[PDB]
Amino acid sequence: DPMVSKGEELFTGVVPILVELDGDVNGHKFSVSGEGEGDATYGKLTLKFICTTGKLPVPWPTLVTTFLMCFARYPDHMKQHDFFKSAMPEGYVQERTIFFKDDGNYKTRAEVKFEGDTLVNRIELKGIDFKEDGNILGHKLEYNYNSHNVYIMADKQKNGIKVNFKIRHNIEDGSVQLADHYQQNTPIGDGPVLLPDNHYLSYQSALSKDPNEKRDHMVLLEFVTAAGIT
């Protein structure tokens, strides 16, 4: 399929990644840079993010979803359903509203595309209605992360996809902070794109610290595999 081919040819080996985020949550401004690499053959991403404005005013775990579904491993039987690669290299726009239960919300807009050989995720994040002393602005979320399926459906009217899902972040007192994600992706280009049957992506995410890093940062290892169409 010369359409499946054009995506295979962009993602087959290890692809360098750059992430840039401009943030404003309740007027706490911040910027984050990330660098790393993905190997979609293995559904594998390795990234390190640095708060370049100083202290991150929110918990790192709250940013993990915002900080590359083109790096999903799509099994051979499901290649016709890989919207994310099909949009490249022109890329796509990824928009979210994430609702933190009993607290504020994030609205994100990102553009995911190639700049040369480098896959780039440029993001703007605005958070509003947070409790200065809640789980988020009060930094009461544990530095860990649970596995989660993410359900993708076509959005035929918008030539794109919609993704709906819940993340539960562990709170330090043993409870959980729900973060209900609503998501829409649309290709940046005018060309044809693969619009998928309903399926899901399985995520596992592991958060760590670089022992030689003094700046405020997050090391993120993700494995992501499409499934749900036998």
From Swiss-Prot:
Effect of residue 99 to S: In alphaGFP/cycle 3 GFP; improves folding at 37 degrees Celsius, reduces aggregation at high concentrations, and increases the diffusibility of the protein inside cells
Keyword entries, A-Z: Chromophore, Luminescence, Photoprotein
Effect on the protein of changing residue 103 to E: In mut1.27; shifts fluorescence lifetime from 3.03 to 2.85 ns
Effect of residue 155 to V: In EBFP2.0; shifts the excitation and emission spectra to shorter wavelengths and increases quantum yields compared to BFP
Tissue: Photocytes.
Effect seen on changing residue 67 to L: In EGFP; increases fluorescence at warmer temperatures such as 37 degrees Celsius. In EBFP; gives rise to variants with blue fluorescence
Pfam families, per database record: GFP (PF01353)
Secretion signal, residue range per the UniProt entry: none
Post-translational modifications reported in the UniProt record: Contains a chromophore consisting of modified amino acid residues. Maturation of the chromophore requires nothing other than molecular oxygen.
UniProt-reported outcome of changing residue 42 to N: In EBFP1.2; shifts the excitation and emission spectra to shorter wavelengths and increases quantum yields compared to BFP
Family under the similarity heading: Belongs to the GFP family.
Chain's role: Energy-transfer acceptor. Its role is to transduce the blue chemiluminescence of the protein aequorin into green fluorescent light by energy transfer. Fluoresces in vivo upon receiving energy from the Ca(2+)-activated photoprotein aequorin.
Protein name: Green fluorescent protein
The gene coding this protein: GFP
